[PDB]
Amino acid sequence: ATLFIADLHLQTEEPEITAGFLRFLQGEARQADALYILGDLFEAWIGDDDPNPLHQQIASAIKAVVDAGVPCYFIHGNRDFLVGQRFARQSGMILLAEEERLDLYGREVLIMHGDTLCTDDQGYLAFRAKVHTPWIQRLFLALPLFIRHRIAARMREIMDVNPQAVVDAMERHHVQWLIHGHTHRPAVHELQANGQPAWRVVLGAWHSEGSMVKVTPDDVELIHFPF
Amino acid sequence: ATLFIADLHLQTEEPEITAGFLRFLQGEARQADALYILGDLFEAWIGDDDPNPLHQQIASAIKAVVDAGVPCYFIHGNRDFLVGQRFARQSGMILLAEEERLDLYGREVLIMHGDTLCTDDQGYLAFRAKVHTPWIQRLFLALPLFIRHRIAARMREIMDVNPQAVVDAMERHHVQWLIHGHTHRPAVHELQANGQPAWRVVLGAWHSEGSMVKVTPDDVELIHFPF
Ligand SMILES: CS(=O)(=O)Nc1cccc(C(=O)Nc2ccc(S(=O)(=O)N3CCN(c4cc(Cl)cc(Cl)c4)CC3)cc2)c1
Ligand SMILES: CS(=O)(=O)Nc1cccc(C(=O)Nc2ccc(S(=O)(=O)N3CCN(c4cc(Cl)cc(Cl)c4)CC3)cc2)c1
Ligand SMILES: [Mn+2]
Ligand SMILES: [Mn+2]
Ligand SMILES: [Mn+2]
Ligand SMILES: [Mn+2]
């Protein structure tokens, strides 16, 4: 089984979610062939140099899973797009592109975070355009941490996918399977893409529950678990 | 694993749901310790004497599962409260009460259809009161089928659970686990009952997806599958 999670929004304020996640990595995840984290692992990220102890707890727990022979992958979300190569090294996680097309035991599956599909949010697409320009990233990161923190804190209902952008994405990739998070509305959806039945499996956020998508040679399941 | 499904709303108009259900009984269900169907197996029921061929296909598929050594149980829903002992015999399914308290591998779980929890629907509780009076049932059933059909067809958004009725029910049973359908909003909910954390796992309707709850010594999962 290949596992997909997303939208853990981990943070110091919510340590129950953290312990939930550690129990999942210590347990379920070990038996997996691979684990993909499709973004919003962290509620916020201001750079890999952040000393926040949570960052190292997590990277440590994930690394042990990779050290167990189970490869962990990451796609960025809107919350944690600044996660970088140093965090990758600490956690043993391989960073991936915003869209990937997997071959899962013969089945071709498109994964992303899901936020690029929410094209009816004009104004988020402004924000995203800008925070993805390298030189805006490099600028932000070369500030000193204490100012990054102040910029973050001073910055204080999720628009669902545009249906057409979903089709276009599954058609651009010629796939009948899509897995994403971001929208926080866990569900299996049916649609038409490439003139055939297609499915969009949506992961949920981790609050009271956790969730995952489990892909096998024969099946694709979306699973909710309580803690 | 003990499986719980509900809300298949099976009917001649939707044969894809039927084939989906047959594939589940032929496959997943065989490996189970037991299968509980928590109501709305059928979109409508006017009595066990109905010759509708779908009724016998289904009873046949279920019976093979029981004949495989996997006990199947049924709680009535609002749609199929007239399912009776003859259908039980044809299908090998044991009929159960509207609430049961199970011991699942040491864990005490309340199951019901879920409609009795929707107490803010004044007017459904009228309908239910009446159609559950024996002599109103016996009257209806002693009509001739052709008139039952006409009464049914002439009869042509689901109110969610009242939160307090949920607590009261879990408290009446002294349980920290509840499984039900009816509301068609699949989810895991956290709450307080008996002054402890409790969980309410809700099954979904079968349309594009199927769903089930899988209970093991260690875990309670809600699973969506596509067809
Ligand atoms: C579609 S939606 O997601 O529902 N709504 C929506 C709309 C607009 C923005 C967002 C959103 O994610 N905002 C957001 C807010 C804070 C954060 S953060 O992790 O605290 N952090 C990320 C890095 N930020 C940053 C700031 C600058 Cl100066 C330049 C660059 Cl490079 C990055 C500073 C703040 C990350 C993201 C969310
Ligand atoms: C809360 S809700 O479910 O969202 N809304 C709601 C409100 C009120 C009623 C219902 C509802 O389930 N109606 C309903 C309609 C039809 C059916 S049925 O299966 O076709 N069938 C059941 C048996 N019926 C019957 C009729 C009489 Cl004369 C006496 C008796 Cl003994 C039974 C005849 C009709 C079964 C149920 C649903
Ligand atoms: Mn998210
Ligand atoms: Mn997101
Ligand atoms: Mn129903
Ligand atoms: Mn119902």
UniProtKB/Swiss-Prot annotation, chains A, B:
Q: Which reaction equation describes what this protein catalyses?
A: UDP-2-N,3-O-bis[(3R)-3-hydroxytetradecanoyl]-alpha-D-glucosamine + H2O = 2-N,3-O-bis[(3R)-3-hydroxytetradecanoyl]-alpha-D-glucosaminyl 1-phosphate + UMP + 2 H(+)
Q: Which GO terms describe its biological process?
A: lipid A biosynthetic process
Q: What class of enzyme is it?
A: hydrolase
| Cofactor binding note of this UniProt entry | Binds 2 Mn(2+) ions per subunit in a binuclear metal center.
Q: Which cofactor does it need?
A: Mn(2+)
SUPFAM superfamilies, from UniProt?
Answer: Metallo-dependent phosphatases
Pathway, per UniProt? Glycolipid biosynthesis; lipid IV(A) biosynthesis; lipid IV(A) from (3R)-3-hydroxytetradecanoyl-[acyl-carrier-protein] and UDP-N-acetyl-alpha-D-glucosamine: step 4/6
> Any idea of its EC number?
3.6.1.54
**Entry keyword Lipid metabolism:** yes
In the bilayer, the protein is annotated as: Peripheral membrane protein
Compartments where found: Cell inner membrane
Q: Which key words tag this protein in UniProt?
A: Cell inner membrane, Cell membrane, Hydrolase, Lipid A biosynthesis, Lipid biosynthesis, Lipid metabolism, Manganese, Membrane, Metal-binding
Molecular function terms, GO-annotated: manganese ion binding; UDP-2,3-diacylglucosamine hydrolase activity
Give residues annotated as binding Mn(2+) 2: 40, 78, 113, 182
Q: Which GO terms describe its cellular component?
A: cytoplasm; extrinsic component of plasma membrane
Question: What protein family does this chain belong to?
Answer: Belongs to the LpxH family.
Q: What does this protein do?
A: Hydrolyzes the pyrophosphate bond of UDP-2,3-diacylglucosamine to yield 2,3-diacylglucosamine 1-phosphate (lipid X) and UMP by catalyzing the attack of water at the alpha-P atom. Involved in the biosynthesis of lipid A, a phosphorylated glycolipid that anchors the lipopolysaccharide to the outer membrane of the cell.
What NCBIfam families is this protein classified in?
lipid_A_lpxH, PRK05340.1
What is the official name of this protein in its record? Answer: UDP-2,3-diacylglucosamine hydrolase
Q: Which organism is it from?
A: Klebsiella pneumoniae subsp. pneumoniae (strain ATCC 700721 / MGH 78578)
High-level lineage: Bacteria, Pseudomonadati, Pseudomonadota, Gammaproteobacteria, Enterobacterales
Q: Which gene encodes it?
A: lpxH
